[PDB]
Amino acid sequence: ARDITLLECVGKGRYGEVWRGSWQGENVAVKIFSSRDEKSWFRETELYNTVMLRHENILGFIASDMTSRHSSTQLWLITHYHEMGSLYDYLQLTTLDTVSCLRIVLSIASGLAHLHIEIFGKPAIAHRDLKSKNILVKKNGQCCIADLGLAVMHSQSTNQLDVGNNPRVGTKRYMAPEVLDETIQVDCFDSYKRVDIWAFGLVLWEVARRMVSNGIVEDYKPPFYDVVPNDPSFEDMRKVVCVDQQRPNIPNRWFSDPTLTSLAKLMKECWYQNPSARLTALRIKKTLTKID
Amino acid sequence: RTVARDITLLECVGKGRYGEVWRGSWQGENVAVKIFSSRDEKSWFRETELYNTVMLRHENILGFIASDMTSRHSSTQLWLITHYHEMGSLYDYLQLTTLDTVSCLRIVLSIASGLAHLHIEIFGTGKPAIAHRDLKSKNILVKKNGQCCIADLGLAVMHRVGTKRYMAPEVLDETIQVDCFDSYKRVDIWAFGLVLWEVARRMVSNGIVEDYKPPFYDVVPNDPSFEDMRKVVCVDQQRPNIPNRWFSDPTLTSLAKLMKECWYQNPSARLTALRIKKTLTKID
Lengths: 292, 284
Ligand SMILES: COc1cc(-c2cncc(-c3ccc(C4CCN(C)CC4)cc3)c2C)cc(OC)c1OC
Ligand SMILES: COc1cc(-c2cncc(-c3ccc(C4CCN(C)CC4)cc3)c2C)cc(OC)c1OC
Ligand SMILES: COc1cc(-c2cncc(-c3ccc(C4CCN(C)CC4)cc3)c2C)cc(OC)c1OC
Ligand SMILES: COc1cc(-c2cncc(-c3ccc(C4CCN(C)CC4)cc3)c2C)cc(OC)c1OC
Fold this sequence. Notes:
Largest sheet of chain A: 5 strands, antiparallel
Helix content of chain A: 25-40%
Subcellular location (chain B): Membrane
Enzyme class (chain B): transferase
Membrane topology (chain B): Single-pass type I membrane protein
Strand content of chain A: 15-25%
Protein name (chain B): Activin receptor type-1
Largest interface: A-B, 31 and 26 residues
Bound molecules: the ligand COc1cc(-c2cncc(-c3ccc(C4CCN(C)CC4)cc3)c2C)cc(OC)c1OC
Radius of gyration of chain A: 19 Å
CATH topology of the largest domain in chain A: Transferase(Phosphotransferase), domain 1
Strand order of the largest sheet of chain A: 1-2-3-5-4
CATH superfamily of the largest domain in chain A: Transferase(Phosphotransferase) domain 1
Order of helices and strands of chain A: EEEHEEHHEEEEEHHHHH
Number of domains of chain A: 2
Number of strands of chain A: 10
GO molecular function (chain B): activin binding; activin receptor activity, type I; ATP binding; BMP receptor activity; cadherin binding; metal ion binding; peptide hormone binding; protein homodimerization activity
Oligomer: homodimer
Number of helices of chain A: 8
CATH class of the largest domain in chain A: Mainly Alpha
């Protein structure tokens, strides 16, 4: 049984469209890529060829298709469906307790360490577009990382780095200093891992804002909401992150709560301008495993 | 809307190291389904990457329908779906069938037409230049209208090794200029000249025809080694035999000349696919 029914559109953007569909009686997600993003479709397909990519905290792959008649091409990705939506959606109108906040951020750290660490198989993988819209929320209170169209792969045993062919760049709001100032070392796998760590720290901040302590919580805001225009340009982000050396502010109410005090320390160790000073994904996972 | 993806696999029409090809049915319509071996996964990726870059559409190119990747419990399944040609490969067809002047010319001009379409860069939104890198009579299909189409872009390059029996001298002696796209066109032209020879042998003249044989059948073993081929093609500089009977027939006399000008040791002396088309249009 291969047939799918497209039932409702759950997202439309420059990327294309995502539909809730039905397959063998179950919900699936069907992404139809824009022509503009054909190189993301092919990269995501290369990544999902890897059987040992499968993980609790990585969006589950069902199929990939490229179809054509005459001069028209359609590009399809079929995945598991998460009806709670993205972490971005979820944080807009839910607050968290300690247990839920740590479960979410540990699950994302678990997914990211699974990507970064080679299995001897699954190459080491850097994502390059980590953000709260690219994380889905699951009914077990864990999350899974989505969108491997920009990913970079590295194999330690063979000294092979595969940066793919995709002129797409990461989401501007989440770009590390070395991406915004274009000094990143493009032939260095560790450089791409460190870009993911920066973005992870931003997602940690977005989540922690929504965790209640002492009867107080912050409203959902995206990273740098206070310092850049709506719909910030590459140069807008370069100004605040590289010129102004801005980092997200830590609300002072966090310092009364031991959990949020520990999280503030962790996100600050994701945000050093020196990429080599940043924590590893494995260290973040070990730190979050110890925090309560 | 309903997205009907079910394909009924009806009969296996090919099995090899590459995997399998099946005649299949989608929505009442025959399709061909290549199911890739794990050995040959990179051929699926390369053909899929090429079609994601340029949707080739030509009478003499096998028609693309789909690339499908399906997650299994323990493996990834890779299918390429194309038009189905019930007459099968030119290799298959030549075993039994003999040709007359009109059919022989229609076959070889259709292959040259496909090959020139691959080779040529077209500007606009056009196509990059493409070299095939594994041209042979098993990678050409026969159509009911008497024309052929070129198949298998798993080794194609845009601007696994080729089949050893069809390798040009510069591939066998490792002198090929690998940073020069024209080098890869010239390797295809060599292979084209061998396919021309295979087809010409099956053209009847004055009641005479040669039996089907693959190129170099009289000088190398079955599944020749790289070294077997190097010694024939590079060291001794042998070329396929032209029978005397061809020189009584004006079509086969012209085709002998053409195939000679695809087999020069010096790759830059070989005819271009566009020049081969022009020559073929002036025969008969
Ligand atoms: C993959 O292959 C086959 C596909 C199909 C097929 C099935 N549904 C819909 C379509 C379709 C409709 C509309 C557009 C365009 C039209 C103009 N503009 C507005 C953009 C949209 C594109 C595509 C097709 C082509 C049929 C086939 O054979 C009958 C195929 O061949 C096996
Ligand atoms: C990020 O990337 C991909 C994501 C998905 C995906 C998978 N499950 C569920 C969803 C989803 C469903 C519903 C809502 C919302 C809709 C409106 N409101 C806010 C309530 C609920 C949001 C999101 C998505 C978008 C699939 C993908 O590919 C098939 C993705 O690309 C890799
Ligand atoms: C995913 O996988 C396979 C799909 C198909 C297939 C089946 N029905 C319809 C389609 C279709 C084509 C094109 C559009 C257009 C129409 C609207 N326009 C504005 C944009 C989109 C819609 C639908 C397809 C592509 C066949 C397959 O096998 C032969 C598939 O598996 C390889
Ligand atoms: C070289 O490469 C590819 C070829 C094909 C392909 C396309 N049409 C028809 C065929 C075929 C059908 C039927 C017979 C036989 C059946 C028994 N008897 C009656 C003699 C003839 C042979 C061959 C094939 C093999 C598809 C491919 O991919 C999907 C190929 O790979 C790119």
